[PDB]
């Protein structure tokens, strides 16, 4: 990779947006105040889940070093393989191609339920060879790289 450039200053500002009080630590309440301002309604369980993934020690809150660690993470192929496995769950035949209707279905109707306009941008970014199945190994690579 590379040594962090002024993106240290960009992340310091972004860290400061959650850290309303300036104590140097992001709490669950500080993260919820930001998410609800965006129109989201997350559960205290969801806040704890998000906070636990970035907290490296155990103090239950995020400092700026752990924030930098989190914001500076496409772990080679190790994170490509996991997205590739998630796509394989819906690859019924096991060939490496999923139908446009099937992909549109899982993305709109379950999970985090993406909008129709997001799924359109999604299918559009993979230039379908006419009206054919979409290869998701090309999707994983376009995403990671």
């Amino acid at each position: 990779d590379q040594l962090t450039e002024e993106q240290i200053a960009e992340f310091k500002e972004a860290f400061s947006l959650f850290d309303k009080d300036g104590d140097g630590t992001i709490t669950t309440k500080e993260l919820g105040t930001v998410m609800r301002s965006l129109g989201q309604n997350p559960t205290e369980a969801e806040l704890q889940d998000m906070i636990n993934e970035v907290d490296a020690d155990g103090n239950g809150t995020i400092d700026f070093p752990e924030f930098l660690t989190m914001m500076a993470r496409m772990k080679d192929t190790d994170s490509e393989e996991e997205i590739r496995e998630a796509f394989r769950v819906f690859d019924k035949d096991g060939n490496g191609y999923i139908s446009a209707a099937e992909l549109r279905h899982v993305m709109t109707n379950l999970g985090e339920k993406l909008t129709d306009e997001e799924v359109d941008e999604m299918i559009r970014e993979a230039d379908i060879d006419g009206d054919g199945p979409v290869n998701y190994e090309e999707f994983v690579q376009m995403m990671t790289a």
Partner: protein, 64 residues
């Protein structure tokens, strides 16, 4: 099967994290509460979508 929602959520959460790097993406239309989207919002939005991706990762690992 119970890895179906974790896999779907992992795909959806990675794509939303990858699409938020496009300032003209359709993924910005979902925030209907916010009248006009300044750059100090998109910062927090990217941070949140990154956290949501890491627990979509954690939930999927616990089911694959």
């Amino acid at each position: 099967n119970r890895q179906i929602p974790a896999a779907a959520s992992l795909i959806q959460t990675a794509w939303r994290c990858y699409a938020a790097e496009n300032p003209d993406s359709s993924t910005w239309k979902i925030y209907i509460r916010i009248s006009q989207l300044r750059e100090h919002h998109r910062a927090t939005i990217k941070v949140i979508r990154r956290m949501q991706y890491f627990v979509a990762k954690k939930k999927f690992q616990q089911a694959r």
